[PDB]
Amino acid sequence: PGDQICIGYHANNSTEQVDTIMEKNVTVTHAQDILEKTHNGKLCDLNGVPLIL
Amino acid sequence: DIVLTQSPGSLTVSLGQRATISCRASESVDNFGKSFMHWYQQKPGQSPKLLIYRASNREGIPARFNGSGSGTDFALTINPVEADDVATYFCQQSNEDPRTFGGGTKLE
Amino acid sequence: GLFGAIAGFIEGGWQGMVDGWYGYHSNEQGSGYAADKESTQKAIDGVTNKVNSIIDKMNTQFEAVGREFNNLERRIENLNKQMEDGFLDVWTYNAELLVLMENERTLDFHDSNVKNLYDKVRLQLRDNAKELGNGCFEFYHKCDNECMESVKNGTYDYPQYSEEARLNREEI
Amino acid sequence: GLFGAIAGFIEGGWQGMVDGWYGYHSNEQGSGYAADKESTQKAIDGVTNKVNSIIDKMNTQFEAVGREFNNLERRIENLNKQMEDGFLDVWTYNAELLVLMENERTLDFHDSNVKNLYDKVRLQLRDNAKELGNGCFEFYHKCDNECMESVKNGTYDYPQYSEEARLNREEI
Amino acid sequence: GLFGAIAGFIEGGWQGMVDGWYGYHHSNEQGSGYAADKESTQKAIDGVTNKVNSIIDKMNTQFEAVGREFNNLERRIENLNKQMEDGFLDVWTYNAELLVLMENERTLDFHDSNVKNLYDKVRLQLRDNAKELGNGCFEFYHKCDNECMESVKNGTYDYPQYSEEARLNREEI
Ligand SMILES: *[C@@H]1O[C@H](CO)[C@@H](O)[C@H](O)[C@H]1NC(C)=O
Fold first, then answer.
1. DSSP letter string over chain C?
2. How many domains does chain D have?
3. What CATH number corresponds to the domain at position C76?
4. Among B56, B100, C93, D159, which one is least packed by beta carbons within 10 Å?
């Protein structure tokens, strides 16, 4: 019957999970991966300069 | 294309003196802190030969060859000039395809 | 969480609000979502500085070096290995723990920003509105779009609506 | 504490409630203690995971190894000793500090669970009860045992008692 | 901050209160003035002081570098020794820097929490005998003389004593 205003927070279709001390696998709206896990499996030149024996 | 222009075109220098051949790049050839310039020597009647890599370090090459320079302009310094130095000298950059060479400088 | 807002007295987030993390209406002119730019930017700055601080604190981390030893240097070989693994294990703990600890604080940080936003509105409205108890305040007066905007930017003129609010409270 | 509940606005715990950490009544049918199973189990899970996480994070800790050296190996002997003590001191700090830090958070965690429980009831009762200000709400209506149970399991029907509450407020 | 008080619903501190961190400003007929809540202030002082002393205490078993010499054919253990020393120096520098950063953040929020608790201490006493202005101030629905002000400040407010004169003043409003 009356005008109203609501306070609320964001949500989305994210499936990204994150861990904490008290809880594991916490789905979260946004997360940043900070661990690199891939390499090119090759020995390469370093900044335009290796001696391969 | 990084146009490489050598100067002078032909250089006649007295025996036992100093030859000073220059190279000039249209844009820089110089990132990662190193210069990606190379000097090549073509003694007449045979294939070119590698003298200097990344603008300063000698490849069995006598010390008479001074590789110097940074950025847009470089210089191959031959001093003292010996007898078996008649050749045409080339600078070529590797900083960015397509690999481009200089006009070349003939030494007398 | 720690502050009772996110998944607390406000039971659920809004897929509908998309221009921010925290925000707000429903009147005669119509309804719609809007993000509180101020509290959102504060949180963004806080989390961004946090992420950048974590990555910064780790620049002086241990870096393993190849070292070789012969058959009669087995002791210092092993010492060297224990030293390397030793630091690798310490710094792995430090990175893992730091992330776990600051994650927990981050979730509670958002919870706190929300609870503060709710309180920001509540402390403005006072008896000029009714606490529904779900993050919503039902007004005791007419709140047009411009009035909605005053609540959202902290310029609510409480006494302007005080009388029409008080009268509406008392027939109730 | 951090949240003002434990040893705060609720000045003291109850020896009488024994089936849980947090909980609740006094009506005509009689009085008694009861634990909030939900908030208690949440805390138990949280603290248990915390304890298990602390013990888990320490599995890659340093392990000292016996190593022998002769009279002309005093330098690497000493290096080896400094290395061992070095890691032993680091990991002792890490265990001591972790325990100190998480203890502090644990006490405040309980404080927060309590303050949330109080708010859970408060946000349900609204004007249907009076905040005594000591963790107790005095009802403005009749709350039988089944009504007490609805407050405890979050199913309080506010409007059902709204009228008899409002009438009792106004003769006051 | 975390608790919404300092630089929150109480927008600003008082240059005027100087005998403590947290306290009251009253205003009645007898006159106005600042006063520190001695109890909550002393608690905070004790907490912060123990915190500072605990940080300095936890660091007594820190690494201490020792001069060691090596010759030209001991370059490996020289380097090992250097890596070991820098290794611990870097760890303990991280530990000191991080500990200070983390406990600083908790300290600021600790003060925020002490304030929010102080406000709640008064609020829970006054109840409907006063109006929440929403800025850290409560406007009374009755007469509060200096002795009454002192009862609010030391947690001995007699709510029912003023209950009737408060209720009457609420209802002509
Ligand atoms: C977390 O989720 C992953 C897979 O998405 C799985 O490896 C694991 O069982 C989960 N553990 C917990 C405790 O939720």
1. -TTSTBTTTB-S-BTT--S-SEE--EETTEE---B-HHHHHHHHHHHHHHHHHHHHHTTT----------TT-HHHHHHHHHHHHHHHHHHHHHHHHHHHHHHHHHHHHHHHHHHHHHHHHHHHHGGGEEE-SSSEEEESS---HHHHHHHHTT---HHHHHHHHHHHHHT-
2. 1
3. 3.90.20.10
4. D159
Q: How many helices (H) and strands (E) does chain D have?
A: 4, 4
Written as six digits, the tokens of A3 are: 């005008």
Contact across the interface for B33 and A47, Cβ inside 8 Å? yes
Cross-chain CB nearest to D83 (options C83, C90, C97): C83
Q: Which residue has the tokens 């090596």?
A: E70
Cα separation, C8 vs D115, in Å, equals: 12
How many CB atoms are closer than 10 A to CB E4? Answer: 24
Cα–Cα distance for residue pair C38/C36, rounded to 1 Å: 6
Chains near C, with 3+ CB pairs < 8 A?
A, D, E
What six digits make up the tokens of C135?
A: 């993050």
Q: Which residues pair with E153 in a beta bridge?
A: none
CB D115 within 8 A of CB D3: yes
CA A42 from chain center: how many Å? Answer: 26
Question: D147: closest CA among D128, D134, D132, D131?
Answer: D128
D9: tokens are: 């606005």
**Resolution of the deposited coordinates, in angstroms?**
7.0
Q: To 5 degrees, how large is the angle CA D61–CA D63–CA D67?
A: 155
Strand D137-139 with E23-28, pairing: unpaired
Which residue's alpha carbon is at the smallest distance from atom 7 of ligand 1?
Answer: A25
Per 3-state DSSP, what percentage of chain E is helix, strand, and coil (rounded to 5)? Answer: 55, 10, 30
Structural element, H or E, at residue E130? strand E130-132
Question: Which residues in D lie closer than 8 A to residue E91 (C-beta atoms)?
Answer: 90
Number of structural domains found in chain B: 1
Parent domain of D33: 1-172
Contact: C61, E90; criterion CB under 8 Å: yes
CA distance C1 to chain E (A): 13
CATH number at B104 reads 2.60.40.10
Contacts of A47 in chain B (CB under 8 A): 32-34
Residue C100 in contact with partner chain D when CB distance is under 8 A: yes
Question: How far does residue A32's CA lie from ligand 1's centre (Å)?
Answer: 18
Are D47 and D61 within 8 A, CB to CB? no
Q: Spell out the alpha helix ranges (H) of B40-83.
A: none
How big is the A-C interface in CB pairs under 8 Å? Answer: 94
Method: X-ray
Name every protein residue with a CB atom under 6 angstroms from any ligand 1 atom.
A 24-25
* Residue bearing the CA closest to ligand 1, atom 8: A25
Helix H, strand E, coil C: the string for C93-135 is HHHHHHHHHHHHHHHHHHHHHHHHHHHHHHHHHHHHEEECCCC
